[PDB]
Design a protein around this ligand. Sequence first.
Ligand SMILES: Nc1ncnc2c1ncn2[C@@H]1O[C@H](COP(=O)(O)OP(=O)(O)O)[C@@H](O)[C@H]1O
Ligand SMILES: Nc1ncnc2c1ncn2[C@@H]1O[C@H](COP(=O)(O)OP(=O)(O)O)[C@@H](O)[C@H]1O
Ligand SMILES: Nc1ncnc2c1ncn2[C@@H]1O[C@H](COP(=O)(O)OP(=O)(O)O)[C@@H](O)[C@H]1O
Ligand SMILES: Nc1ncnc2c1ncn2[C@@H]1O[C@H](COP(=O)(O)OP(=O)(O)O)[C@@H](O)[C@H]1O
Lengths: 408, 461
Amino acid sequence: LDQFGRNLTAAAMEGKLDPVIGREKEIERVMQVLSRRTKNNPVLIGEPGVGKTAVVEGLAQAIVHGEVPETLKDKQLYTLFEERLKKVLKEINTRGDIILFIDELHTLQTIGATTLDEYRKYIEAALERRFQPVQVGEPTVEHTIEILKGLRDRYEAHHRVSITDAAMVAAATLADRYINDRFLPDKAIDLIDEAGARMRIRRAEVDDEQIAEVLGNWTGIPVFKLTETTRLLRMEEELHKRIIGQEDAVKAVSKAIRRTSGSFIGVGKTELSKALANFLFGDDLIQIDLTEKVRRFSVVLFDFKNTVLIFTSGLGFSKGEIIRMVDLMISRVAGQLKSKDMALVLTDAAKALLAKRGFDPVLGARPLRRTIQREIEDQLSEKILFEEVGPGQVVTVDVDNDAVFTFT
Amino acid sequence: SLVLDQFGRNLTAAAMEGKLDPVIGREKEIERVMQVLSRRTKNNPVLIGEPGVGKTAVVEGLAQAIVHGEVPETLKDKQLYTLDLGSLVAGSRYRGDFEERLKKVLKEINTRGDIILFIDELHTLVIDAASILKPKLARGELQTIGATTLDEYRKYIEKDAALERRFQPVQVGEPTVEHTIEILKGLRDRYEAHHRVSITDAAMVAAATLADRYINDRFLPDKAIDLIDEAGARMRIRAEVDDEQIAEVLGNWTGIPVFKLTETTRLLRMEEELHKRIIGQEDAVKAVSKAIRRTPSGSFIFGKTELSKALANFLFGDDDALIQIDMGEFHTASRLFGAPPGYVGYEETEKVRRKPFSVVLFDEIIYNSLLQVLEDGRLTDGQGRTVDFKNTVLIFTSNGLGFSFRPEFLNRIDDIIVREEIIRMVDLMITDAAKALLAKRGFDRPLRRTIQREIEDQLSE
Ligand SMILES: Nc1ncnc2c1ncn2[C@@H]1O[C@H](COP(=O)(O)OP(=O)(O)O)[C@@H](O)[C@H]1O
Ligand SMILES: Nc1ncnc2c1ncn2[C@@H]1O[C@H](COP(=O)(O)OP(=O)(O)O)[C@@H](O)[C@H]1O
Ligand SMILES: Nc1ncnc2c1ncn2[C@@H]1O[C@H](COP(=O)(O)OP(=O)(O)O)[C@@H](O)[C@H]1O
Ligand SMILES: Nc1ncnc2c1ncn2[C@@H]1O[C@H](COP(=O)(O)OP(=O)(O)O)[C@@H](O)[C@H]1O
């Protein structure tokens, strides 16, 4: 009747349907399954946005162009209370030259399209006998580039702008890298369409920089990172900005990861991994002591293409920078005092005593924080409560004489 | 029949119209179902069998028998109606949505009187459908035919004694390869007509045998017919169907070269194929090739790991067929059978069961189980399920002071296996002086690490 659903083949002949390219194998598989005595109905399985309806559109284009076998050339695809459904089904049966495409079959000769999860939940026992799953893989960066080239003319016509091939390459690569949550065929198109809309709003051409700034606006990442081995030659400075000492290890790690993802095996290790994760990705990383976390570009620390893996770990008669760490640790106390209108100053002898008492060569700087808390935070808080130190005063910490601190 | 026509298909009417396919070699099951249905009370057969074996086919055969009139006097004119509980429950969201439709169907059946229900997936029956149907099934006023697999029947229907006693089990075994070939020959005409192609009996035999050999998760009558249908469709998208096309289809399904599917001649190239993947140790590979060629399938005592990997790749499966077991850490019940019931490790032999065709390599090598495996080729884990080794191949690996295995174990094993070579190795893993330096550095396992540390490292930068 066509009042319950659109005719895809009529639209394809009219040319309304967008072209689909690079999916010849999926269309061939669908045709094969449709040409089977049993399990005749193929159901397309794939992640959202992959192009599950794109393959059906390509099938419609093929039939209208006549590339399909004889048994399908004369058909006419249709895309879709009980009385009306029964009447339309009777019409389909009596006509018999129609293949029904039911988008999102999980809501329910025919074709269906649903995600793997919904396919398992809703379809996967009586239907299984009549439905044959067909996998629709995610396009790669080059396939996405080809699709973008195909859609360039339509999007330019719609937005009255011009898009360069470099823009397509940048869109595909950046969307794949940063927009990982989404899936490439749809997210690259999204980026291109949004750049075109931006250009239309401004007033024409589109360049890689426009795509980069659109993505930066979306995700908040600075445009510099998106547009910019540039990210690798700056590792040394951006790592020494946070790690104290262990410069040789920093250099070795930077070189080893520059060559290459990479793999590696009580001082600095966790801090170094955190700095690496922040520099290479942006956030301060996974610590264990997992598949869902990594699957959903991260550094994994112990004690997947882009993931970085990091691991950490006589009888008788024989013979014959820490001050910088202390400053960093007391930085928090100094800042909190500043918020209280106070300026903390520590003498060289005071820092030396603090490092001596709170630094364990066996355990590294682990007991340093508690030592600072014991010797300074407690005494300072007591003195603040006694009112002997008031706002606007400079709190100077000295050591006398085993020894003992003193506050002025 | 309007109330029933919206939930199922009248199989008897389909047979009257000739739409149902022929059923070949199922006279025994059909007769047994007739016997069960002829009873006075609890005349509710339940077809037990793994999916795809032909339970629904048995029911269609019964419908055809009813149509032809050969059934006993009690079953004459009886109408077979399928019924899926999914349709009844689907769309139900309120207190009595499903009871209403189930009672409606039961009332229609009572009014008609001559209706026999075939309820596929009877294990889903278990105030619900089971409670509603129980008072009627016991008195034999509602003849029903179920269809479930053995495990589902045991763990759903059997454990409910009240419902269990109302259903008579009827075993439907998987057709044998000869039975599958006969079934295919029975179906040949319909598929030929549908696909407009011709199928040779050689193609049918090849389909049945290859599907039995390679597809370890489907069942003969279904997978063989699936292979035939897929081959017909592939021909259609482009006539006659031959063994080569079936082999191509199967290879496309499961990753396998087409020429391999299409064995003495193929097994004669053992040394030639093995030397491609491994070099050196010519005597050992020749001995292994001879022992396998003449002939659990095989057992050996033993590079070692490389040779086992190459052998597995050449034999059933790719290098993934290898199953490495570190025997050092067992110097223990976990490896043998896991643990007995009621002890830690019962929930988790483990790898052999899922991969019957595999090469089991033991590293650094309790002995009673190994002896049982070697002598009888079977073992029993802690959960009772038996795991077979009749086709697997077992490999066991093993490791100047002063002035200058139990015998039966050693007998059961089929056989024992024990400068330019390094030059070949270095270029296999990738100047003459550089090659010699690499050989001296990595050889006297470390060779790959040395190559990576020096050559790949310096070339990358
Ligand atoms: N191979 C392709 N050719 C042309 N366009 C494609 C192709 N693949 C995906 N697209 C794009 O994918 C977008 C969504 O289509 P689709 O993935 O089929 O919807 P859904 O997966 O949610 O059912 C469309 O905007 C379409 O342009
Ligand atoms: N190898 C390590 N490197 C850095 N921090 C570690 C390491 N091992 C443990 N830590 C833990 O984290 C804290 C030490 O961090 P810290 O010494 O202040 O970093 P840094 O030495 O780089 O300034 C302690 O709680 C310690 O237990
Ligand atoms: N004995 C047989 N004779 C003729 N055809 C058969 C026979 N057995 C199976 N077939 C075919 O093989 C398939 C078997 O599937 P089936 O066993 O009926 O499903 P179920 O899992 O419900 O028992 C069907 O397509 C059937 O047509
Ligand atoms: N360092 C290695 N890493 C991975 N595979 C190796 C390595 N060395 C040898 N192989 C494989 O082992 C074969 C040589 O046998 P070998 O390793 O020397 O066993 P064995 O030392 O017991 O005689 C080679 O054909 C090669 O394929």
